[PDB]
Amino acid sequence: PQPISRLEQCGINANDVKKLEEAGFHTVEAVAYAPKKELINIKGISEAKADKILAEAAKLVPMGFTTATEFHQRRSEIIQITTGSKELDKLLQGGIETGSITEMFGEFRTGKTQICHTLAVTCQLPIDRGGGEGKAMYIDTEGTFRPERLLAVAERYGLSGSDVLDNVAYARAFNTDHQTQLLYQASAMMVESRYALLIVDSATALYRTDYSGRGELSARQMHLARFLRMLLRLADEFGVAVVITNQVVAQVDGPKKPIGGNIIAHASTTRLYLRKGRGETRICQIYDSPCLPEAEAMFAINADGVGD
Amino acid sequence: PQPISRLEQCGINANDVKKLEEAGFHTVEAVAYAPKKELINIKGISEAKADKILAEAAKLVPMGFTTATEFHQRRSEIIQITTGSKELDKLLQGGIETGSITEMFGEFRTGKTQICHTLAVTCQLPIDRGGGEGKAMYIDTEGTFRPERLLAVAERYGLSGSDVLDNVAYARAFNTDHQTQLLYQASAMMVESRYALLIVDSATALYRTDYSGRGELSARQMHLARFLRMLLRLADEFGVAVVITNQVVAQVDGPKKPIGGNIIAHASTTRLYLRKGRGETRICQIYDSPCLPEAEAMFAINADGVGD
Amino acid sequence: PQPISRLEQCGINANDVKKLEEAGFHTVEAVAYAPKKELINIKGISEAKADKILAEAAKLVPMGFTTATEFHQRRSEIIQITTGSKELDKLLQGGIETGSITEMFGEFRTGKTQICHTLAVTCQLPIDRGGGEGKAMYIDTEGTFRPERLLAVAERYGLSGSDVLDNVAYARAFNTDHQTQLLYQASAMMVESRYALLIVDSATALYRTDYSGRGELSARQMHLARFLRMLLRLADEFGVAVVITNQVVAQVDGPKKPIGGNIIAHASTTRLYLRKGRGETRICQIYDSPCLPEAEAMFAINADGVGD
DNA sequence: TTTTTTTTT
Ligand SMILES: Nc1ncnc2c1ncn2[C@@H]1O[C@H](COP(=O)(O)OP(=O)(O)NP(=O)(O)O)[C@@H](O)[C@H]1O
Ligand SMILES: Nc1ncnc2c1ncn2[C@@H]1O[C@H](COP(=O)(O)OP(=O)(O)NP(=O)(O)O)[C@@H](O)[C@H]1O
Ligand SMILES: Nc1ncnc2c1ncn2[C@@H]1O[C@H](COP(=O)(O)OP(=O)(O)NP(=O)(O)O)[C@@H](O)[C@H]1O
Ligand SMILES: [Mg+2]
Ligand SMILES: [Mg+2]
Ligand SMILES: [Mg+2]
């Protein structure tokens, strides 16, 4: 959460750092989490300056070994914003964690984006309501974004819908290339003030299209790396939770399978494979999380969305 | 396990050696396993000093020929920490060996990191339980680290979870560049006191990302060499076991394949290709080990992890 | 096989020769195969002494022209130790030759080191079994050395595993710089008593690591020359067979390729490009040998290793 | 001389 001015100290020129701001960096942790070469790669830099930028970075951010008990206390610290549905929350154990990544597995008609709206509303909630209390930025590629729904879950909780719209920042994307731009813009938006949650219903979606198969292939994946990694960094510098929604290919052989292949799957700190039962009610089975036993349970898609 | 003070003998200045500590070295074996040039490359050194540092190094560490029977007795000596599952242990023949390297082959949802937590817990175990009795340092790039799980396998065995957290040292990485830093920090952490196991769930993971293809390529590989080699040295100076977890590309042609290419594969003293069957149960097929016939067998992923 | 005492004759001081022993030389052939300058370069020498050392060297070792029929008879003389597998032996025409060099081409998981263990066991065998009857010294950089396996192929043939361990001398290396040291140590070990085979699974391996690219490059190669040449000399003074195992880079362009570049390839008297089929069975294609037509054939990796 | 990346439906 910490501005580089605190690194803008101990003799570094302000100017070059101001150049650094342009590249994307804004946190002290940015350099604390900076790849060395990539910081060197900004022009208007002498490498030794990068070296001492690392010096002050290390100086204000520990990155060495720490005791297990400590990190254990940090795992106490995670506010983990609630779904707004008690029993997904019991599935997720207190809801989606702060500073992590999430996945939506589904065909269509599932309401996964609907989940994402309900989350975007509930993030404003005071922690006693299970919220994280932070402004929310939402990015949609299909443009489905439903401020109406924001007003709806606002009606579910009574905080003014105008306050709901006070947060949630929506920019319509299109390129995979635009996404990263939205990400750095997101960063600059961040250090201004605390945010709760990043949402991307369709982080996968653009890649099927900008890249028409195949090979590419690698190149397609090659960009998600550059994409997905950044997401981590954001969560790594604010604790901001991260939600990813994936369109799922049909599997063919002799089924589903998430798109974006393995490279998404490794970054995938957690996974949620959704399904449709009768009615609003839909089935939610967990995959891939250290936090949790694999399991499943139902949740409804009400006029105010996720609940019972 | 032997501090350089024992080399800090027979006339060498303490100071220059204190400079050597800074470069990374801490063991007598470090110089006993030192490349010549690289020791010379530390500043504040005259080369002849390096020469006589080799003199005392050889003086306290044999590096010449030895009888096969002797090394055979050392192969009796390997405690080889058990998995906590008897039948992987029968696959691995008494579990993962001390002072070696290991590999996790899997897609996602496999529990390979889960294996790594269970190992991190079991390392504390007395040798009769198949443990090595040593403090454990765990490094995670995806941050999945699950102290909860540590408490869990603690419940599996009853040693206090607080004791479990007494060991296992966790530092969150990010750069490939940070990794090596964590490694030297690891060394300094080592010579302080005995450790059992190094774990890295995602030693491969950062390289896909810091390096976006291609070429690079070589450079990417070029770093893993510098990385992987160090791991050996650690195991070569403490007997500390080493676990590597690799994210696996999809293979495309007309399948899986481990990432990091050949250069990982050569260092790979052993390999474990994992798969998902139904339920907690997952399939474990061995690759690439002098120790073992190639084979496979099942193991479950319980609430306390690896077992039956 | 001939000690310098036979050169320690016709008036040379014993002392200076004793100094020569220190530099590395031990055979009469050493000076018979000595570079002039390098012998002069030992201190405590007057050049004329080197001159007359050449005089006695020539005096006890012919180095002039000889008839083709004679060398043809020597090509009858090569015992060429068998693989322990009849059909590699038919590939290699009677197995690996005495006093030559060999190469392992493979990715990983190939069993090339496994071949090297099986060879190390079979060298003890009486010539009727296709062995050379000699003690075997094995050097491993990755430490994979498997005395267990020695006992295993011992079980394959029934000579006591204790006798197997009576030979095979194992020293763990690490530097490229250490290697040469192990080589001179090897020499001193040699003239003591006859040996069959030198083995180095990983003569290439250390160079990727001690030298991080590039340039270096030349320097890297520069050392292998100094390395590989010595190997020849050993084989040139004992008939000891020489086995080299090479880790193979991925080739990239628009494949494999052996590492160490051309300079290894020229010394390479022979080459064996290995591959993996199904099961224990692996594919062996010959490259680069005057002796042989280029060809390939299968061989299995049994519990007792190379065979059918 | 060094050096693999990458699923779609
Ligand atoms: N006001 C509402 N009341 C009840 N159900 C609603 C309401 N609004 C939307 N839904 C349901 O929410 C779902 C909307 O589709 P949804 O699955 O959210 O799109 P998606 O998951 O993004 N699939 P796609 O749009 O193809 O990418 C449907 O099941 C709708 O019936
Ligand atoms: N308490 C638990 N009880 C049972 N199973 C569990 C429990 N916690 C985790 N698991 C299982 O362990 C696995 C966790 O995913 P895992 O394969 O360990 O991540 P991973 O191997 O690192 N893949 P990735 O995270 O994408 O790099 C899943 O199969 C979970 O269902
Ligand atoms: N007892 C055994 N029975 C059957 N096969 C075995 C046995 N021991 C080892 N192997 C096989 O031998 C091979 C061991 O790997 P190997 O290729 O020898 O290492 P390598 O060639 O040196 N590659 P690397 O270790 O990365 O440098 C694998 O195919 C094992 O399955
Ligand atoms: Mg949706
Ligand atoms: Mg895992
Ligand atoms: Mg081998």
Nucleotide nearest C253 (Cα, C1'): D3
Strands B66-67 and C101-106: unpaired
Method: cryo-EM
Nearest nucleotide from residue B217 CA, by C1' atom: D3
Nucleotides of D under 7 A from a protein CB: 1-9
Give the closest residue to A265 by CA, choosing from A96, A113, A103, A92.
Answer: A103
Count how many Cα atoms sit within 13 Å of the Cα of residue C179 in the half-sphere of its side chain: 27
Cβ of C86 < 7 Å from strand D?
no
Structural contact between residues A226 and A183, judged by C-beta atoms closer than 8 angstroms: no
Reading the block at residue C300, the tokens are 């299995």
Q: What angle do CA B307, B194, B161 make, to 5 degrees?
A: 45
- Contact of C99 with C29, CB cutoff 8 Å: no
**Could you tell me which residues come within 8 angstroms of residue A211 by beta carbon, excluding any fewer than 6 positions away?**
A176, A217, A219, A220
Query: Is A248 in contact with A105 (CB distance < 8 Å)?
Result: yes
Amino acid identity at C307? G
**Buried b or exposed e, range B137-153, using 16+ CB within 10 angstroms:** bbbbbbbbbbbebbbbb
H helix runs in C158-275, sequence order: 161-166, 176-192, 205-210, 218-238, 261-267
Task: List CB-based neighbours of ion ligand 4 within 5 Å.
Answer: A 112-113
Helices (H), B107-196: 112-122, 147-157, 161-166, 176-192
Ramachandran assignment for C103, one of left (phi > 0), alpha (psi -120 to 50 degrees), beta (any other): beta
- Residue holding tokens 């140590």? C185
Do C226 and C139 lie in one domain? The reply is: yes
C206, C150: one domain: yes
> Is the CB of residue A64 less than 8 Å from the CB of residue B171?
yes
* C110, two tokens: 């190939």
Rg of chain A in Å (alpha carbons): 20
Chain B: touching chains (3 or more CB pairs < 8 Å): A, C
Amino acid at C226: R
Among candidate residues B216, B207, B217, B212, the one with its CA nearest the CA of residue A226: B212
Is the separation of the CB atoms in A80 and A239 below 8 Å?
no
Cis-peptide, bond into residue A216, ω within 30° of zero: yes
Q: Are B65 and B96 in contact (CB under 8 A)?
A: no
Strand partners, C272: C104, C286
**Which one, of C202, C101, C116, C208, lies nearest residue C153 by Cα?**
C116
One-letter amino acid for residue B94 of the chain: G
For strand D, list residues 198-217 of chain A whose Cβ lies within 7 Å of it. 208, 213-215, 217
| Strand-pair category, C195-200 with A135-140 | unpaired
A262·B107 Cβ contact <8 A: yes
For chain C, breaks with the C atom over 2.5 A from the next N come after 254
Q: Whose structure tokens read 């050597």?
A: B20
Chain B window 188-227, residues with Cβ within 7 A of nucleic strand D: 208, 213-215, 217-218, 221-222, 225
The reply to whether omega before C216 is within 30° of 0 (cis) is: yes
Residue B305: closest CA among B80, B73, B150, B188: B150
Is residue B8 located within the same domain as residue B87?
Answer: no
Helices (H), A193-250: 205-210, 218-238
Please give the distance of CA A199 from its chain centroid, rounded to a whole number.
6
Please tell me if the CB atom of residue A293 comes closer than 6 angstroms to any atom of ligand 2.
yes
Sequence-ordered list of residues with C-beta below 8 angstroms from that of A157, at least 6 positions apart, any chain: A121, A122, A125, A129
**Angle at CA of residue B183, ends B239 and B246, nearest 5°:** 80
Structural domain ending residue among the three candidates A40, A72, A104 = A72
In contact, C148 and C112? CB cutoff 8 Å:
no
- Asked whether residue C4 falls in the same domain as residue C98, the answer is no
For tokens 């290995």, the residue is: C274
Q: Which residues pair with A245 in a beta bridge?
A: A104
CB atoms inside a 10 Å sphere around CB A211: 18
Interchain contact, A267 vs B142, CB within 8 Å: yes
User: How far apart are the C-alpha atoms of B132 and B126, rounded to whole Å?
Assistant: 6
Distinct helix (H) and strand (E) counts, chain C: 13, 10
Whether residues A68 and A121 share a domain: the answer is no
Q: Are residues C204 and C94 in the same domain?
A: yes
Taking the C-alpha atoms of residue B103 and residue C109, their distance in angstroms, rounded to an integer, is 13
Same domain, C44 and C95: no
Structure tokens at B298: 């099942």
The beta-carbon neighbor of C174 closest among B33, B37, B294 is B33
Are residues A60 and A80 part of one domain?
no
Are A118 and A274 in contact by the 8 Å Cβ rule? The answer is no
Report whether B145 contacts B138 (CB < 8 A): yes
- Half-sphere exposure for A136 (CA within 13 Å, toward CB): 29
Domain boundary at A56, A72, A88, which? A72
B91 is written with which tokens?
């696959």
| Domain assignment of residue B122, given as a range | 73-308
* Contacts of A47 by beta carbon, 8 Å cutoff, 6+ apart: A40
Contact C209, C260 (CB under 8 A): no
Distance from B148 to chain C by nearest Cα, in Å?
36
Quick one: DSSP state of residue B18? H
Q: Which of A155, A133, A158, A165 is nearest to A239 (CA)?
A: A133
Q: What Rg, from alpha-carbon coordinates, does chain C have?
A: 20
Q: Is A57 exposed, middle or buried (0-12, 13-18, 19+ CB in 10 A)?
A: buried
Is A113 annotated as a binding-site member? yes
Query: Among C51, C72, C93, which residue terminates a domain?
Result: C72
In this structure, are A48 and A115 located in the same domain? Answer: no
CA distances from B146 to A75, A102, B167, B197, B202 (A): 9, 17, 14, 17, 15
Query: Taking CB atoms and an 8 Å limit, are C147 and B72 in contact across chains?
Result: yes
Mutation test of ligand 1: which of A273, A283, A301 has the most ligand atoms closer than 8 Å to its C-beta?
A: A301
Q: Do A19 and A161 sit in the same domain of this protein?
A: no
Q: A107: helix, coil or strand?
A: coil
- Provide the sign of the torsion angle of the four alpha carbons A126, A127, A131, A135, taken in this order: positive
- Which residue from B minimizes the CA distance to C113? B290
Strand-strand pairing, A282-287 and A271-276: antiparallel
Same domain, C202 and C279: yes
Statement to judge: residues C66 and C87 lie in one domain: no
SS3 assignment for B206-249: HHHHHCCCCCCCHHHHHHHHHHHHHHHHHHHHHCCEEEEEEEEC
Q: In sequence order, which residues have a C-beta less than 8 Å from that of residue A228 and are 6 or more positions away?
A: A101, A203, A263, A264, A267, B209
Give phi and psi for B104, each to the nearest 5. Answer: -110, 120
CA of A108 to the centre of ligand 1 (A): 8
Cα distance between residue A130 and residue B262, in whole Å = 48
Question: In total, how many domains does chain B have?
Answer: 2
- Name which residue sits closest to atom 14 of ligand 1, judged by CA: A111
Best of B104, B107, B109 to disrupt the A interface (most A CBs within 10 Å) is B109
